[PDB]
Amino acid sequence: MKVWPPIGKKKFETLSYLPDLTDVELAKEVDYLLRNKWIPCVEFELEHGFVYREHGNTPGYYDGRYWTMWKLPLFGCTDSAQVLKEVEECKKEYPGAFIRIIGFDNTRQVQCISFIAYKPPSF
Amino acid sequence: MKVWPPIGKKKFETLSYLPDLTDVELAKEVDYLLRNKWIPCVEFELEHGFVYREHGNTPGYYDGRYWTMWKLPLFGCTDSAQVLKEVEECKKEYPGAFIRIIGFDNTRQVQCISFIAYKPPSF
Amino acid sequence: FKAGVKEYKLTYYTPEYETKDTDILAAFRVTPQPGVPPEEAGAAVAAESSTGTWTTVWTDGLTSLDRYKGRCYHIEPVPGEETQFIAYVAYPLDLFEEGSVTNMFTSIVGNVFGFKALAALRLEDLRIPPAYTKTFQGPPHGIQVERDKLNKYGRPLLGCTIKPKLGLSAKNYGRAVYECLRGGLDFTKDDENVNSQPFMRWRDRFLFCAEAIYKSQAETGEIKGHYLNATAGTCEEMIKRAVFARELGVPIVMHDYLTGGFTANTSLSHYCRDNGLLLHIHRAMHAVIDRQKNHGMHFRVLAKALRLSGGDHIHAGTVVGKLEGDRESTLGFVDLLRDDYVEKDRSRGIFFTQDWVSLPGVLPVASGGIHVWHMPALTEIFGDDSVLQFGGGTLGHPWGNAPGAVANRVALEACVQARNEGRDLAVEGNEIIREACKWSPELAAACEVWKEITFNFPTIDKL
Amino acid sequence: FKAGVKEYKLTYYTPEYETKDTDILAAFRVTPQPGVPPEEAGAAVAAESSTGTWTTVWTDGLTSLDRYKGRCYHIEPVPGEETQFIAYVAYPLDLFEEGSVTNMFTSIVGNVFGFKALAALRLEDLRIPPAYTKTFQGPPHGIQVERDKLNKYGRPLLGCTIKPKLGLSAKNYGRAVYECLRGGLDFTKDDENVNSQPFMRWRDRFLFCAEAIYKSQAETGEIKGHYLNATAGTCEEMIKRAVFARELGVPIVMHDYLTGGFTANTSLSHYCRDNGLLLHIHRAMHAVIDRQKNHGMHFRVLAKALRLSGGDHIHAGTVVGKLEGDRESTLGFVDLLRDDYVEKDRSRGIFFTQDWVSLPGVLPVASGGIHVWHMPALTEIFGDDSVLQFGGGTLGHPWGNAPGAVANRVALEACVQARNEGRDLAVEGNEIIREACKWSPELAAACEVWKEITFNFPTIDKL
Ligand SMILES: O=C(O)[C@@](O)(COP(=O)(O)O)[C@H](O)[C@H](O)COP(=O)(O)O
Ligand SMILES: O=C(O)[C@@](O)(COP(=O)(O)O)[C@H](O)[C@H](O)COP(=O)(O)O
Ligand SMILES: [Mg+2]
Ligand SMILES: [Mg+2]
């Protein structure tokens, strides 16, 4: 038996139990998002990488769920490279930020995909 | 079609929708009581021949349910004529009274039979 | 701890077990799939209704399966079936939440009926131990208290479902109730599906039915009731309805315990005990569960469950009316509803001896497709501690509700006096009814209408 | 008015009727007794589930049967079946109490299943019109809200029933919950029959489970839940338990909607809407009702009734696991649970087109006898909007709960990426799993234990 570490294993929701994705693997996730007609959007965070409770504690209330939006959603986008270009541009201005890619279905109005694309060196 | 009278048809629970019992039929019901090992008792009433609500009106509360006990239940008596003698004693002492015969099952503590035996001239 | 799948019978088939006096016992009619031996089928039913799942879990070692596991302790074949068998399962007392029929069913019938390895499954009976029975209030009042509150002794009670089932207004409902009650019925009732609806809202109906109860009681001199339906979409709506019945001072409400459900029904039963209201239970939905012989739950299981959760009446079938009711099976569960102690009697489907430790008894209610000509058989089947209900048999009389009620009341009292004087209701019933028509033109008119009406069909659920 | 019995078909068989867009529609699988015509059997079902009884009542003339009666409007013989047919019944909107599943079932399935003249009866589907749907709250939150509250996107959620079913102490329950959640599961849960019992009282369990939720959430950085069971014997106890879960600030509770009942479930659904609690619904007892093809109610009817009464999850079967669930029927009622509009499609058991008029969607939960090798098939059947639950499949891992949770999480995410990069889960599933064993030891240990475990038996309820 091997024991699952109780430290140093902080997670990032979907895909974060797999080894870190490669840039082609990140591009292929964007490809899947676009093939499903979802709207891609980049979000980034510099201070609270994980959910916390500071301002409330009632059922279903947490802090740290909202990140900051990077520009706007790429409506009518057709290139996963354009999404990765904004991740690189965000990486360059905020190298200490976590950065994630999300995807919206505007008919159901639900984010149908979400995965981290960059983690800062402080992590 | 015949219309059921809405007046002049006051009733007295079990058997009161049949023709009045003869003295042989009254005794026949007393025989049934005794055959079942029930213990008979006579009750009579001079003022409230029917249930009413004077002292309360909550669910399951009514006045006029208790009548007055004639003597005591005839424990160990197994002759119908003894019971009917008690009706006769009651009826001569209280000719203006309603008089009924009841029978208890003491294992279940349920009155298993009850029927009118005399109704006063005022009725 | 050894990880992996093993057979349930290695842990849950214990044919050597002796049931404890605190165990809840269950008798299951099991039809396993081809290739599945009865020992394994029975052990899977015991395992997955108590402590077990499909693979070995290490957490078993933190407690004691010995004290907690359900156990299939006996397996007996079914005469006339090649694969089907009865499996007897014993459940420790600690498995169950006190006072909760909901929890008891959740274990015993929660998941096992859907196992792929079983082709069919039916719970036939349960043995409820005294140590579990004493955790339940049971009926708010019960047979003895009900007769005493209403001052009614010596004969079955008489009731009647207002018809048409749906579509009547509140004022027309109270009109029908008054005319029925004043003719000699002790009760009338909302149909099971009369709750609150566009054609008639509940509060309006309650108000007019109260006017009818008290008018008919003042007229006749006999205590009257009308089962006011508390069944509702939410517990809050259900309780609101009962509170208004309480305000009105009336004696009896009703609940559809299966469609409302056991959690709600137990709440209402407690309310009725707290406020002195009789509680008539309608078994709507039961035949979805209890009709077929090979799968489901027998009504005697649902009847015991109602006695535990609580109700003063429960419908028990007619045998001879429009809904199915096997005679010997019905006599069995009528005893289980009324009596303090019922010995095992497989000839009447009673799989286990059942001690009720003075839990109050429930009045069985015979209702559905019955009329005056049925009175001798009903009186003979059920005896004095029952309610006989004539909806169509009252509102279908050619002279109206009051003469229909008189016909039914005369027909019943004729049977009582005949039986009390020695006549056999089971053989002289038509004579008894016929002879009573002489001085009762009302009964005569009902006899003419329904003389050739009988309900004889193949019995689906035979003993 | 003419007293006496008529055939039901004279009033209630109306094959020319045109259904209205406000009607509730029902498809019944009817098996009449020998000698009973389908038109009369179908009229009897329509009559005794709406306005009629066994004999003509004069009160019909006070109202309008034309506007209130249910109508058997169509008869559809069943192929390969001599006497069995589908009967189609339309019920006017006014028959039903707004917001009350209890009332809807009381009419449609109340008495008709016990009729002597029928040998068997099953309700297969119902068409709920938008005019009645809008009287229901439905789920307290629904799929979109739940994912938003939990911050979980792009994959199925993962759950796990703590085991053994019964017998664990409160402290030991919380220990298992912590070790499960910290390994990558989103949820754990009380077993359906874990309520409050001598071996573990509910309030102690809720307290220690809260400690485990917050410890594992702090450790992993992901929002965690444990379904705390509010099922109880009375509505008062049920609400008490939900109030304490609200005090603790936890995200999700659960309820056994069938053993608790619809009246209690609707009350709990409203409470959860009022207080922001997700409500996982366990379908304990459903197979008593839904297993056999000839009698009962199909699960799709029970699933629609839950979506009306209210729940954020409901168990919907696995297809591949230990409990029965036909694949095509399951695909049909999963759509009925999740989607806003579902077109009629008998190939998936959908008898009526169902419009949900924006009522929230319910997350289907696949649970029971599933393990790591089933992950590709489960992901393929249900897609991202599901909960896949592994009780024995986690607490059965040879290294314990955290490695067991890691195995399930890794397998799931490996299926997701493989799918998202264009692979065929239905054909490459086993190779996808073997590739992940290459870098996940936790998954490798799980695959070795369960490699040869499948559940394949003849399906009882087929289309
Ligand atoms: O809806 C009905 O049909 C009834 O009102 C009877 O009406 P009628 O008196 O007009 O027949 C009763 O609720 C049924 O007897 C219930 O069935 P059961 O007692 O078997 O549960
Ligand atoms: O009691 C059980 O068996 C479970 O906890 C599963 O345990 P495992 O995960 O250990 O198998 C679930 O409640 C069943 O899946 C319910 O069945 P369904 O989902 O069909 O309603
Ligand atoms: Mg009815
Ligand atoms: Mg479970």
Residue numbers in the entry:
A (entry chain I), B (entry chain J): 1 to 123
C (entry chain B), D (entry chain A): 13 to 475
Authors' text:
Here, we describe the crystal structure of the activated form of Rubisco from A. thaliana at 1.5 Å resolution with a bound transition-state analogue, 2-carboxy-d-arabinitol 1,5-bisphos­phate (2-CABP). Clear electron density was observed for residues 13–475 of the 479-amino-acid LSu and residues 1–123 of the 125-amino-acid SSu. The A. thaliana Rubisco structure is in the ‘activated state’, in which a carbamate formed at the catalytic lysine residue (Lys201) is stabilized by Mg2+. Interpretation of the electron density indicates that the A. thaliana Rubisco SSu protein sequence in the structure presented in this study contains the RbcS1B isoform. There is only one amino-acid difference between RbcS1B and Rbcs2B/RbcS3B in the residues that were resolved in this structure: residue 22 is a serine in Rbcs2B/RbcS3B and is a threonine in RbcS1B and this structure. The resulting occupancies and difference maps were most consistent with this residue being threonine at full occupancy (data not shown). Furthermore, there was no mixture of residues at any given SSu amino acid in the structure, indicating that the Rubisco isoform that crystallized under these conditions was homogenous with respect to RbcS content. Thus, whereas the A. thaliana Rubisco LSu sequence is very similar to that of rice Rubisco (94% amino-acid identity), which is reflected by a high structural resemblance between their LSus (r.m.s.d. of 0.25 Å), a significantly lower structural resemblance is observed in the SSus (r.m.s.d. of 1.20 Å), although the sequence similarity is only slightly lower (72% amino-acid identity) than those for the other crop plants (74–76% amino-acid identity). The crystal structure presented in this study provides the structural framework to interpret A. thaliana Rubisco kinetics and interactions with accessory proteins, and adds to a growing database of higher plant Rubisco structures.
